[PDB]
Amino acid sequence: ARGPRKHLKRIAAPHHWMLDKLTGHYAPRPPGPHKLRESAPLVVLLRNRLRYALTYREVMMIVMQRLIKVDNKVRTDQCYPAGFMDVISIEKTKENFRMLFDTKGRFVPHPIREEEASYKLCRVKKVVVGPKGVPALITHDGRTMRYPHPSIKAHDCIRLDLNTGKIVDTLKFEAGNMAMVTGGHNVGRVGVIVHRERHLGGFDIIHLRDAKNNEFATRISNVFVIGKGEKAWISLPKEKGIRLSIMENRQVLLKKQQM
Amino acid sequence: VQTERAFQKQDGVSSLGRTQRYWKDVGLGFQTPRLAKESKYVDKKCPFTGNVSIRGRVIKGMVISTKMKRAVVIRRNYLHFVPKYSRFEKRHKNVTCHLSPCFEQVKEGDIVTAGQCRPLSKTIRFNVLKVEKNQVFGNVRKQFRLF
Amino acid sequence: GISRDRRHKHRRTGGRMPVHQKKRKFELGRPPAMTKLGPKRVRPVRCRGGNMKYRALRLDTGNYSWSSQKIAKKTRLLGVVYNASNNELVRTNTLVKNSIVAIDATPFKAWFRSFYGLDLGHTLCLQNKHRQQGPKLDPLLEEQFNTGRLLACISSRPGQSGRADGYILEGEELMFYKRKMDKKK
RNA sequence: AACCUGGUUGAUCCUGCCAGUAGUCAUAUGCUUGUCUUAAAGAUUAAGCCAUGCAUGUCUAAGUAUAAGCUUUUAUACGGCUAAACUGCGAAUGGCUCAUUAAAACAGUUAUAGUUUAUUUGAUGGUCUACAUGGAUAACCGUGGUAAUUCUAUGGCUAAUACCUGCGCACAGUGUUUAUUAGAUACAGAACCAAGGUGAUUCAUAGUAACCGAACGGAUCGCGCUGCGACGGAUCAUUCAAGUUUCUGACCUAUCAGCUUUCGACGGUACUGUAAUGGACUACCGUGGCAGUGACGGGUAACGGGGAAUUAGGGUUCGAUUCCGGAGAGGGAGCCUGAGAAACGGCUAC
RNA sequence: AAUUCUAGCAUCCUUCUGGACUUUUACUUUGAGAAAAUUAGAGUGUUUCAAGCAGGCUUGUCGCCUUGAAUACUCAGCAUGGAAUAAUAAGA
RNA sequence: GAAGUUUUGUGAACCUUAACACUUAGAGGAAGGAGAAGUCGUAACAAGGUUUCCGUAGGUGAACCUGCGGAAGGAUCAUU
């Protein structure tokens, strides 16, 4: 009541962080570009994915060196919400991490090449006219690129340059274009787009087809266009967003563990 | 027509336009009626004539009285499941609802579809979209139709 | 204070509504400034957000747009003439929205001489062009000008803005309110 | 494990209850008790009352240093380091409890074209003595009052990212307030004269005519013709939110059947008020609204849900209590400051 | 060849290049979206076990298993394929 | 821009009356069950010595009795 809540609790955290039940009563709380449940804070990358830090203390000792950057910019706050399709860049080690969705429905820092780690994609939420009658995009990231093409519509991605501010490569939202899912049940799945239903009132949905010919649906808010009909602007994680079945995921896992 | 103490005037039309009439197109797959365009009535709260969006829900039901001015009340009927006995149960809710004077001769026991809008008074949230003439015999509140 | 909420007062059934909560600041109202004629005074009320909302208390003057001619002049007020809601507000001269008011009309008469040169009671070319471009003036407005007054509807909310603005009455609105002035007489 | 034995008769077969039996990751209590791992615990009745101590404070190269402080390096404005004090930000989170409360709250499901939003993230913007404007305030020094406290007066100095003013092109910006034009779209054209965006708008935005000062357009700070970032503040998104809001859903009770209204009950017009929508409130006007599918009223040893116990299936009972809402700080009521409180480890009154 | 689903032909629409019409729902099917904890449950010798979400290989050192922590479950509401059943509508 | 002050609204608290709710005293009256054994009958169970019972009415120490109309749960499934 009475104002914004400064604590978040463990358990009442998101499940896709995979913070454990014991070993803490509270969990780190991420406001930044991204939402609370559609992001992951910079602490649980460093300690609970990348395994650089042990403790919450040690993440302060890393981040206040000014070694961590995101989007070619130094972020000093340890609880910064670093979300979908943000680049992370550490100068020592000289390795870069683009955050994608894993096929199971988790965040994972996908390691990438140095030339690839310049650019990143931003799907545009809407397009809107600012003052002096100038046009302007706005993104899922909460950037606002201005003077686009007239070409560029809602619900489609743009390759940003990052080294400079400006856009470079557009993409369109149509049938036969590659598209990852960012939320809901089918998260972490990439497939070409077959068809979308309108439903003139609320909630457009899209059916789309995995590269092993599995068909599945999501709302348009969740869908995020990568690239053209086959091929893709970005590098993909392990499995490339197929999501193999429950008995298959059993068989591959226990076949691994026997060595 | 000027019934009231204040001058009833349609916003949308400027004082420069004093012949011209404003009419909105409400959308959502609902056609604008002809008597909205042709006639000379005002209504602030009409979907087709004045400032009110329709947005969110749409509700069908049976009209049970049309006594109060520029407003009706619409009996919704529905079955309620009772999982122990594995068996249904007839309930109702009287939604009170605005209607505009484009719809001439809205009789008791007519069918009427009605979209949600901002709260216009305490009881009414919904506004009319479209009506249909049908007879009903004896009492209207007895008449159970599910839609 | 003044509670705007629906937790007090009856249900549609005619039943008392249970209330288990104390009044909330976001369910606020405030005492109404029945603002009037006089020399100007205005009070900044600090509202929710931090945002300021300026309460009128006495207003002499206002910006009033003639619609047809497409001009607006700053003008002094004389008196409140009619109100739709309440006759007590006319009795005290209380400015509110939709309230019909008297106006000097010497700003418009000076403009109408200067712009057109038909009047009431190198350029010349510019005046002629303006006349061709836009001056017949209704028969009732011709009679109305002779007194040194006009009639006009207050369009702004003085309580929120801290400002009396309006527009001049013309055509059907003007013919309408001339009935209900004459009817009480 | 989908389970059954004893008791009415001189005896039998029934209906039928009483008693037995088992579980509780439910309390209490008796007797007994060697070991290690995990661990509920002033909820039930008295949301009865409280001694003492503690639970909210906070400083970077970067707001203000003349401690009549320290420290060895010795600096004609300012060597650093810093008590104290002013300014900024926080104190509205967390924690505790379950007395209220029965279409209320809450749950899932919409809407916000009906709105406010510190901060974060990204945008934007020359248009109105400019080598620099003003005078007071602590701590400090001198000095008192009172029995007594986080009581404080008089006198003397001095600061600012405190407080208040305030020129400016490279008539004239942005914002506020009203009026008002454009904001096109199922087909091709011919002759004559004087192109954003929604399912959807009065939306975005541009243009025209004026309005006010009551708001922005940097009199700020550190490292180093020239880079980096600290702070301030406006509008627009964004994020953390919050406020309302659509639909559907609850235990017992009819030895509760008719409730609601001139003092808002249901609706209409036009104000007012609010962050905005509304009988939310005020004028006039109409006579409505709910109910036998349970209105209105009463009871609860009732906060709601996620859940818990219970060995076929269907169910029955519990949920003060780890998470998410809600409400409260002895009882009621009022209010300041702020982005946010009708706050109680803030204030005023009974 | 059984068991699914589907095009034709016995006189079977079309306005276009997937949606519009077939009275309307219920019903059933698949799909969306819906916090975790708890509950069932995949994997794993916490010495067993209640648990927990960890671990496991190995004289190699930018360690590897491009490591795991799956998945189900959550009336009313939104969407959709369908020939019965049952309401309901009607009667150029 | 202080003290003080005018009129409004928000409105604690206290009091009068009334109603509703819930505990609680009461001379006397009059129920039910328990004792564990008393006094007076004998009503029912057999045709229980006047068959039993129902509804209603009146009367009497008490069970009960009688009037009118029913029932077999009767002591008769039965005879121009």
mmCIF file with all atom_site columns, N, CA and C (backbone and C1' of nucleotides) in Angstrom, chain C residues 4 6 9-10 13 22 24 30 40 46 55 63 85 98 155 157 160, chain D residues 178-179 210 213 245 265 270 272-275 279 281 283 328-329 340:
data_model
loop_
_atom_site.group_PDB
_atom_site.id
_atom_site.type_symbol
_atom_site.label_atom_id
_atom_site.label_alt_id
_atom_site.label_comp_id
_atom_site.label_asym_id
_atom_site.label_entity_id
_atom_site.label_seq_id
_atom_site.pdbx_PDB_ins_code
_atom_site.Cartn_x
_atom_site.Cartn_y
_atom_site.Cartn_z
_atom_site.occupancy
_atom_site.B_iso_or_equiv
_atom_site.pdbx_formal_charge
_atom_site.auth_seq_id
_atom_site.auth_comp_id
_atom_site.auth_asym_id
_atom_site.auth_atom_id
_atom_site.pdbx_PDB_model_num
ATOM 1   N N     . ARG C 1 4   ? -15.285 11.762 -2.180  1.00 0.00 ? 4   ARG C N     1
ATOM 2   C CA    . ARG C 1 4   ? -15.938 11.495 -3.473  1.00 0.00 ? 4   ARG C CA    1
ATOM 3   C C     . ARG C 1 4   ? -16.384 10.035 -3.663  1.00 0.00 ? 4   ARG C C     1
ATOM 4   N N     . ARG C 1 6   ? -17.763 5.962  -3.381  1.00 0.00 ? 6   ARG C N     1
ATOM 5   C CA    . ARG C 1 6   ? -19.071 5.303  -3.392  1.00 0.00 ? 6   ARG C CA    1
ATOM 6   C C     . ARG C 1 6   ? -19.271 4.330  -2.213  1.00 0.00 ? 6   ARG C C     1
ATOM 7   N N     . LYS C 1 9   ? -23.221 6.025  0.986   1.00 0.00 ? 9   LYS C N     1
ATOM 8   C CA    . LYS C 1 9   ? -24.414 6.036  0.119   1.00 0.00 ? 9   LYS C CA    1
ATOM 9   C C     . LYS C 1 9   ? -24.831 4.637  -0.369  1.00 0.00 ? 9   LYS C C     1
ATOM 10  N N     . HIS C 1 10  ? -26.080 4.546  -0.820  1.00 0.00 ? 10  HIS C N     1
ATOM 11  C CA    . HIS C 1 10  ? -26.793 3.270  -0.932  1.00 0.00 ? 10  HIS C CA    1
ATOM 12  C C     . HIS C 1 10  ? -26.346 2.472  -2.155  1.00 0.00 ? 10  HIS C C     1
ATOM 13  N N     . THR C 1 13  ? -29.988 -1.747 -4.908  1.00 0.00 ? 13  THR C N     1
ATOM 14  C CA    . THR C 1 13  ? -31.045 -2.514 -4.236  1.00 0.00 ? 13  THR C CA    1
ATOM 15  C C     . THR C 1 13  ? -31.771 -1.753 -3.118  1.00 0.00 ? 13  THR C C     1
ATOM 16  N N     . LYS C 1 22  ? -11.124 3.555  6.325   1.00 0.00 ? 22  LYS C N     1
ATOM 17  C CA    . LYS C 1 22  ? -11.143 4.975  6.628   1.00 0.00 ? 22  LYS C CA    1
ATOM 18  C C     . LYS C 1 22  ? -11.039 5.730  5.312   1.00 0.00 ? 22  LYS C C     1
ATOM 19  N N     . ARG C 1 24  ? -9.812  7.826  2.193   1.00 0.00 ? 24  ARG C N     1
ATOM 20  C CA    . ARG C 1 24  ? -8.537  7.826  1.483   1.00 0.00 ? 24  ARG C CA    1
ATOM 21  C C     . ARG C 1 24  ? -8.290  9.143  0.748   1.00 0.00 ? 24  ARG C C     1
ATOM 22  N N     . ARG C 1 30  ? -12.746 19.108 -2.688  1.00 0.00 ? 30  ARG C N     1
ATOM 23  C CA    . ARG C 1 30  ? -12.433 20.381 -2.034  1.00 0.00 ? 30  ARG C CA    1
ATOM 24  C C     . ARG C 1 30  ? -13.618 21.352 -2.086  1.00 0.00 ? 30  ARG C C     1
ATOM 25  N N     . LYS C 1 40  ? -8.971  41.304 -9.830  1.00 0.00 ? 40  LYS C N     1
ATOM 26  C CA    . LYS C 1 40  ? -8.513  39.919 -9.972  1.00 0.00 ? 40  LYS C CA    1
ATOM 27  C C     . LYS C 1 40  ? -7.840  39.396 -8.703  1.00 0.00 ? 40  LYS C C     1
ATOM 28  N N     . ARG C 1 46  ? -2.234  23.297 -4.602  1.00 0.00 ? 46  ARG C N     1
ATOM 29  C CA    . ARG C 1 46  ? -1.351  22.160 -4.867  1.00 0.00 ? 46  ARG C CA    1
ATOM 30  C C     . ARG C 1 46  ? -2.154  20.856 -4.857  1.00 0.00 ? 46  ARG C C     1
ATOM 31  N N     . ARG C 1 55  ? -7.202  28.381 -8.592  1.00 0.00 ? 55  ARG C N     1
ATOM 32  C CA    . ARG C 1 55  ? -8.585  28.640 -8.202  1.00 0.00 ? 55  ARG C CA    1
ATOM 33  C C     . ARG C 1 55  ? -8.914  30.119 -8.376  1.00 0.00 ? 55  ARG C C     1
ATOM 34  N N     . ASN C 1 63  ? -10.656 36.637 -22.210 1.00 0.00 ? 63  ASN C N     1
ATOM 35  C CA    . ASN C 1 63  ? -10.428 36.492 -23.649 1.00 0.00 ? 63  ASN C CA    1
ATOM 36  C C     . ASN C 1 63  ? -11.635 35.837 -24.324 1.00 0.00 ? 63  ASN C C     1
ATOM 37  N N     . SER C 1 85  ? -28.373 26.402 -14.869 1.00 0.00 ? 85  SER C N     1
ATOM 38  C CA    . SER C 1 85  ? -28.464 25.557 -13.679 1.00 0.00 ? 85  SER C CA    1
ATOM 39  C C     . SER C 1 85  ? -29.253 26.232 -12.559 1.00 0.00 ? 85  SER C C     1
ATOM 40  N N     . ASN C 1 98  ? -20.664 27.719 -18.971 1.00 0.00 ? 98  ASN C N     1
ATOM 41  C CA    . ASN C 1 98  ? -22.010 27.791 -19.562 1.00 0.00 ? 98  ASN C CA    1
ATOM 42  C C     . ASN C 1 98  ? -22.848 29.003 -19.114 1.00 0.00 ? 98  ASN C C     1
ATOM 43  N N     . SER C 1 155 ? -16.882 29.690 -21.461 1.00 0.00 ? 155 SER C N     1
ATOM 44  C CA    . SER C 1 155 ? -16.527 28.380 -22.017 1.00 0.00 ? 155 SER C CA    1
ATOM 45  C C     . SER C 1 155 ? -15.512 27.631 -21.149 1.00 0.00 ? 155 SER C C     1
ATOM 46  N N     . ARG C 1 157 ? -13.671 26.595 -17.544 1.00 0.00 ? 157 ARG C N     1
ATOM 47  C CA    . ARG C 1 157 ? -13.975 26.398 -16.125 1.00 0.00 ? 157 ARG C CA    1
ATOM 48  C C     . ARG C 1 157 ? -13.066 27.321 -15.305 1.00 0.00 ? 157 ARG C C     1
ATOM 49  N N     . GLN C 1 160 ? -10.862 25.593 -12.243 1.00 0.00 ? 160 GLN C N     1
ATOM 50  C CA    . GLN C 1 160 ? -9.704  24.754 -12.579 1.00 0.00 ? 160 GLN C CA    1
ATOM 51  C C     . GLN C 1 160 ? -8.584  25.581 -13.212 1.00 0.00 ? 160 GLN C C     1
ATOM 52  P P     . U   D 2 178 ? -9.945  25.077 -21.897 1.00 0.00 ? 178 U   D P     1
ATOM 53  O "O5'" . U   D 2 178 ? -10.496 26.090 -22.996 1.00 0.00 ? 178 U   D "O5'" 1
ATOM 54  C "C5'" . U   D 2 178 ? -11.753 26.764 -22.798 1.00 0.00 ? 178 U   D "C5'" 1
ATOM 55  C "C4'" . U   D 2 178 ? -11.928 27.913 -23.766 1.00 0.00 ? 178 U   D "C4'" 1
ATOM 56  C "C3'" . U   D 2 178 ? -12.299 27.558 -25.195 1.00 0.00 ? 178 U   D "C3'" 1
ATOM 57  O "O3'" . U   D 2 178 ? -13.662 27.164 -25.338 1.00 0.00 ? 178 U   D "O3'" 1
ATOM 58  C "C1'" . U   D 2 178 ? -10.695 29.295 -25.194 1.00 0.00 ? 178 U   D "C1'" 1
ATOM 59  P P     . A   D 2 179 ? -14.107 26.225 -26.565 1.00 0.00 ? 179 A   D P     1
ATOM 60  O "O5'" . A   D 2 179 ? -13.927 27.176 -27.829 1.00 0.00 ? 179 A   D "O5'" 1
ATOM 61  C "C5'" . A   D 2 179 ? -14.875 28.222 -28.108 1.00 0.00 ? 179 A   D "C5'" 1
ATOM 62  C "C4'" . A   D 2 179 ? -14.410 29.065 -29.271 1.00 0.00 ? 179 A   D "C4'" 1
ATOM 63  C "C3'" . A   D 2 179 ? -14.336 28.364 -30.622 1.00 0.00 ? 179 A   D "C3'" 1
ATOM 64  O "O3'" . A   D 2 179 ? -15.616 28.237 -31.236 1.00 0.00 ? 179 A   D "O3'" 1
ATOM 65  C "C1'" . A   D 2 179 ? -12.388 29.661 -30.299 1.00 0.00 ? 179 A   D "C1'" 1
ATOM 66  P P     . A   D 2 210 ? -4.057  38.441 -33.482 1.00 0.00 ? 210 A   D P     1
ATOM 67  O "O5'" . A   D 2 210 ? -4.762  38.792 -32.096 1.00 0.00 ? 210 A   D "O5'" 1
ATOM 68  C "C5'" . A   D 2 210 ? -4.076  38.679 -30.834 1.00 0.00 ? 210 A   D "C5'" 1
ATOM 69  C "C4'" . A   D 2 210 ? -5.041  38.208 -29.773 1.00 0.00 ? 210 A   D "C4'" 1
ATOM 70  C "C3'" . A   D 2 210 ? -4.454  38.020 -28.378 1.00 0.00 ? 210 A   D "C3'" 1
ATOM 71  O "O3'" . A   D 2 210 ? -4.403  39.259 -27.676 1.00 0.00 ? 210 A   D "O3'" 1
ATOM 72  C "C1'" . A   D 2 210 ? -5.742  36.120 -28.960 1.00 0.00 ? 210 A   D "C1'" 1
ATOM 73  P P     . G   D 2 213 ? -1.084  37.647 -14.920 1.00 0.00 ? 213 G   D P     1
ATOM 74  O "O5'" . G   D 2 213 ? 0.328   36.961 -14.657 1.00 0.00 ? 213 G   D "O5'" 1
ATOM 75  C "C5'" . G   D 2 213 ? 0.446   35.874 -13.725 1.00 0.00 ? 213 G   D "C5'" 1
ATOM 76  C "C4'" . G   D 2 213 ? 1.785   35.198 -13.873 1.00 0.00 ? 213 G   D "C4'" 1
ATOM 77  C "C3'" . G   D 2 213 ? 3.006   36.094 -13.719 1.00 0.00 ? 213 G   D "C3'" 1
ATOM 78  O "O3'" . G   D 2 213 ? 3.210   36.528 -12.364 1.00 0.00 ? 213 G   D "O3'" 1
ATOM 79  C "C1'" . G   D 2 213 ? 3.264   34.708 -15.628 1.00 0.00 ? 213 G   D "C1'" 1
ATOM 80  P P     . U   D 2 245 ? -15.355 1.673  -9.165  1.00 0.00 ? 245 U   D P     1
ATOM 81  O "O5'" . U   D 2 245 ? -15.310 0.966  -10.592 1.00 0.00 ? 245 U   D "O5'" 1
ATOM 82  C "C5'" . U   D 2 245 ? -15.673 1.687  -11.784 1.00 0.00 ? 245 U   D "C5'" 1
ATOM 83  C "C4'" . U   D 2 245 ? -15.223 0.944  -13.019 1.00 0.00 ? 245 U   D "C4'" 1
ATOM 84  C "C3'" . U   D 2 245 ? -15.646 -0.511 -13.125 1.00 0.00 ? 245 U   D "C3'" 1
ATOM 85  O "O3'" . U   D 2 245 ? -17.014 -0.614 -13.517 1.00 0.00 ? 245 U   D "O3'" 1
ATOM 86  C "C1'" . U   D 2 245 ? -13.379 -0.287 -13.774 1.00 0.00 ? 245 U   D "C1'" 1
ATOM 87  P P     . A   D 2 265 ? -28.519 7.729  -1.363  1.00 0.00 ? 265 A   D P     1
ATOM 88  O "O5'" . A   D 2 265 ? -29.871 7.082  -1.907  1.00 0.00 ? 265 A   D "O5'" 1
ATOM 89  C "C5'" . A   D 2 265 ? -30.061 6.866  -3.317  1.00 0.00 ? 265 A   D "C5'" 1
ATOM 90  C "C4'" . A   D 2 265 ? -31.236 5.949  -3.567  1.00 0.00 ? 265 A   D "C4'" 1
ATOM 91  C "C3'" . A   D 2 265 ? -31.543 5.659  -5.033  1.00 0.00 ? 265 A   D "C3'" 1
ATOM 92  O "O3'" . A   D 2 265 ? -30.815 4.524  -5.489  1.00 0.00 ? 265 A   D "O3'" 1
ATOM 93  C "C1'" . A   D 2 265 ? -33.528 6.324  -3.928  1.00 0.00 ? 265 A   D "C1'" 1
ATOM 94  P P     . A   D 2 270 ? -25.941 18.864 -21.327 1.00 0.00 ? 270 A   D P     1
ATOM 95  O "O5'" . A   D 2 270 ? -25.591 20.021 -20.291 1.00 0.00 ? 270 A   D "O5'" 1
ATOM 96  C "C5'" . A   D 2 270 ? -25.806 21.399 -20.641 1.00 0.00 ? 270 A   D "C5'" 1
ATOM 97  C "C4'" . A   D 2 270 ? -25.778 22.271 -19.408 1.00 0.00 ? 270 A   D "C4'" 1
ATOM 98  C "C3'" . A   D 2 270 ? -24.506 22.228 -18.568 1.00 0.00 ? 270 A   D "C3'" 1
ATOM 99  O "O3'" . A   D 2 270 ? -23.413 22.950 -19.128 1.00 0.00 ? 270 A   D "O3'" 1
ATOM 100 C "C1'" . A   D 2 270 ? -26.375 22.116 -17.143 1.00 0.00 ? 270 A   D "C1'" 1
ATOM 101 P P     . U   D 2 272 ? -17.978 24.671 -13.950 1.00 0.00 ? 272 U   D P     1
ATOM 102 O "O5'" . U   D 2 272 ? -17.920 24.240 -12.418 1.00 0.00 ? 272 U   D "O5'" 1
ATOM 103 C "C5'" . U   D 2 272 ? -18.298 25.147 -11.366 1.00 0.00 ? 272 U   D "C5'" 1
ATOM 104 C "C4'" . U   D 2 272 ? -18.562 24.384 -10.089 1.00 0.00 ? 272 U   D "C4'" 1
ATOM 105 C "C3'" . U   D 2 272 ? -17.392 23.582 -9.539  1.00 0.00 ? 272 U   D "C3'" 1
ATOM 106 O "O3'" . U   D 2 272 ? -16.505 24.417 -8.797  1.00 0.00 ? 272 U   D "O3'" 1
ATOM 107 C "C1'" . U   D 2 272 ? -19.364 22.261 -9.499  1.00 0.00 ? 272 U   D "C1'" 1
ATOM 108 P P     . G   D 2 273 ? -14.917 24.232 -8.930  1.00 0.00 ? 273 G   D P     1
ATOM 109 O "O5'" . G   D 2 273 ? -14.680 22.764 -8.358  1.00 0.00 ? 273 G   D "O5'" 1
ATOM 110 C "C5'" . G   D 2 273 ? -14.852 22.495 -6.955  1.00 0.00 ? 273 G   D "C5'" 1
ATOM 111 C "C4'" . G   D 2 273 ? -14.761 21.012 -6.665  1.00 0.00 ? 273 G   D "C4'" 1
ATOM 112 C "C3'" . G   D 2 273 ? -13.539 20.283 -7.197  1.00 0.00 ? 273 G   D "C3'" 1
ATOM 113 O "O3'" . G   D 2 273 ? -12.387 20.497 -6.386  1.00 0.00 ? 273 G   D "O3'" 1
ATOM 114 C "C1'" . G   D 2 273 ? -15.471 18.996 -7.628  1.00 0.00 ? 273 G   D "C1'" 1
ATOM 115 P P     . U   D 2 274 ? -10.925 20.457 -7.042  1.00 0.00 ? 274 U   D P     1
ATOM 116 O "O5'" . U   D 2 274 ? -10.709 18.912 -7.353  1.00 0.00 ? 274 U   D "O5'" 1
ATOM 117 C "C5'" . U   D 2 274 ? -10.505 17.956 -6.299  1.00 0.00 ? 274 U   D "C5'" 1
ATOM 118 C "C4'" . U   D 2 274 ? -10.536 16.556 -6.864  1.00 0.00 ? 274 U   D "C4'" 1
ATOM 119 C "C3'" . U   D 2 274 ? -9.429  16.221 -7.850  1.00 0.00 ? 274 U   D "C3'" 1
ATOM 120 O "O3'" . U   D 2 274 ? -8.243  15.846 -7.157  1.00 0.00 ? 274 U   D "O3'" 1
ATOM 121 C "C1'" . U   D 2 274 ? -11.521 15.471 -8.695  1.00 0.00 ? 274 U   D "C1'" 1
ATOM 122 P P     . A   D 2 275 ? -6.878  16.631 -7.430  1.00 0.00 ? 275 A   D P     1
ATOM 123 O "O5'" . A   D 2 275 ? -6.692  16.463 -9.003  1.00 0.00 ? 275 A   D "O5'" 1
ATOM 124 C "C5'" . A   D 2 275 ? -5.394  16.491 -9.634  1.00 0.00 ? 275 A   D "C5'" 1
ATOM 125 C "C4'" . A   D 2 275 ? -5.326  15.494 -10.772 1.00 0.00 ? 275 A   D "C4'" 1
ATOM 126 C "C3'" . A   D 2 275 ? -6.643  15.143 -11.464 1.00 0.00 ? 275 A   D "C3'" 1
ATOM 127 O "O3'" . A   D 2 275 ? -6.906  16.085 -12.499 1.00 0.00 ? 275 A   D "O3'" 1
ATOM 128 C "C1'" . A   D 2 275 ? -5.455  13.157 -10.936 1.00 0.00 ? 275 A   D "C1'" 1
ATOM 129 P P     . G   D 2 279 ? -23.563 11.924 -12.911 1.00 0.00 ? 279 G   D P     1
ATOM 130 O "O5'" . G   D 2 279 ? -23.935 11.883 -11.363 1.00 0.00 ? 279 G   D "O5'" 1
ATOM 131 C "C5'" . G   D 2 279 ? -24.555 10.718 -10.784 1.00 0.00 ? 279 G   D "C5'" 1
ATOM 132 C "C4'" . G   D 2 279 ? -24.206 10.617 -9.321  1.00 0.00 ? 279 G   D "C4'" 1
ATOM 133 C "C3'" . G   D 2 279 ? -24.875 9.468  -8.574  1.00 0.00 ? 279 G   D "C3'" 1
ATOM 134 O "O3'" . G   D 2 279 ? -24.100 9.012  -7.462  1.00 0.00 ? 279 G   D "O3'" 1
ATOM 135 C "C1'" . G   D 2 279 ? -25.635 11.498 -7.684  1.00 0.00 ? 279 G   D "C1'" 1
ATOM 136 P P     . C   D 2 281 ? -23.103 12.172 -3.327  1.00 0.00 ? 281 C   D P     1
ATOM 137 O "O5'" . C   D 2 281 ? -22.918 13.730 -3.601  1.00 0.00 ? 281 C   D "O5'" 1
ATOM 138 C "C5'" . C   D 2 281 ? -22.183 14.560 -2.683  1.00 0.00 ? 281 C   D "C5'" 1
ATOM 139 C "C4'" . C   D 2 281 ? -22.081 15.976 -3.204  1.00 0.00 ? 281 C   D "C4'" 1
ATOM 140 C "C3'" . C   D 2 281 ? -23.390 16.664 -3.558  1.00 0.00 ? 281 C   D "C3'" 1
ATOM 141 O "O3'" . C   D 2 281 ? -24.048 17.148 -2.388  1.00 0.00 ? 281 C   D "O3'" 1
ATOM 142 C "C1'" . C   D 2 281 ? -21.792 17.070 -5.259  1.00 0.00 ? 281 C   D "C1'" 1
ATOM 143 P P     . A   D 2 283 ? -29.329 22.073 -3.805  1.00 0.00 ? 283 A   D P     1
ATOM 144 O "O5'" . A   D 2 283 ? -29.466 23.137 -4.981  1.00 0.00 ? 283 A   D "O5'" 1
ATOM 145 C "C5'" . A   D 2 283 ? -30.758 23.441 -5.530  1.00 0.00 ? 283 A   D "C5'" 1
ATOM 146 C "C4'" . A   D 2 283 ? -30.634 24.132 -6.867  1.00 0.00 ? 283 A   D "C4'" 1
ATOM 147 C "C3'" . A   D 2 283 ? -31.775 23.857 -7.845  1.00 0.00 ? 283 A   D "C3'" 1
ATOM 148 O "O3'" . A   D 2 283 ? -32.846 24.770 -7.629  1.00 0.00 ? 283 A   D "O3'" 1
ATOM 149 C "C1'" . A   D 2 283 ? -29.710 23.451 -8.918  1.00 0.00 ? 283 A   D "C1'" 1
ATOM 150 P P     . G   D 2 328 ? -7.803  1.068  7.383   1.00 0.00 ? 328 G   D P     1
ATOM 151 O "O5'" . G   D 2 328 ? -7.203  0.618  8.787   1.00 0.00 ? 328 G   D "O5'" 1
ATOM 152 C "C5'" . G   D 2 328 ? -8.063  0.429  9.927   1.00 0.00 ? 328 G   D "C5'" 1
ATOM 153 C "C4'" . G   D 2 328 ? -7.298  -0.191 11.072  1.00 0.00 ? 328 G   D "C4'" 1
ATOM 154 C "C3'" . G   D 2 328 ? -6.085  0.582  11.564  1.00 0.00 ? 328 G   D "C3'" 1
ATOM 155 O "O3'" . G   D 2 328 ? -6.457  1.657  12.426  1.00 0.00 ? 328 G   D "O3'" 1
ATOM 156 C "C1'" . G   D 2 328 ? -5.564  -1.729 11.388  1.00 0.00 ? 328 G   D "C1'" 1
ATOM 157 P P     . A   D 2 329 ? -5.446  2.879  12.699  1.00 0.00 ? 329 A   D P     1
ATOM 158 O "O5'" . A   D 2 329 ? -4.440  2.284  13.779  1.00 0.00 ? 329 A   D "O5'" 1
ATOM 159 C "C5'" . A   D 2 329 ? -4.871  2.030  15.126  1.00 0.00 ? 329 A   D "C5'" 1
ATOM 160 C "C4'" . A   D 2 329 ? -3.818  1.253  15.880  1.00 0.00 ? 329 A   D "C4'" 1
ATOM 161 C "C3'" . A   D 2 329 ? -2.677  2.082  16.473  1.00 0.00 ? 329 A   D "C3'" 1
ATOM 162 O "O3'" . A   D 2 329 ? -2.247  1.548  17.725  1.00 0.00 ? 329 A   D "O3'" 1
ATOM 163 C "C1'" . A   D 2 329 ? -1.799  0.524  14.935  1.00 0.00 ? 329 A   D "C1'" 1
ATOM 164 P P     . G   D 2 340 ? 1.969   13.454 -4.649  1.00 0.00 ? 340 G   D P     1
ATOM 165 O "O5'" . G   D 2 340 ? 1.821   12.011 -3.993  1.00 0.00 ? 340 G   D "O5'" 1
ATOM 166 C "C5'" . G   D 2 340 ? 1.016   10.992 -4.607  1.00 0.00 ? 340 G   D "C5'" 1
ATOM 167 C "C4'" . G   D 2 340 ? 1.350   9.642  -4.015  1.00 0.00 ? 340 G   D "C4'" 1
ATOM 168 C "C3'" . G   D 2 340 ? 1.097   9.495  -2.522  1.00 0.00 ? 340 G   D "C3'" 1
ATOM 169 O "O3'" . G   D 2 340 ? -0.262  9.124  -2.293  1.00 0.00 ? 340 G   D "O3'" 1
ATOM 170 C "C1'" . G   D 2 340 ? 3.259   8.669  -3.062  1.00 0.00 ? 340 G   D "C1'" 1
#
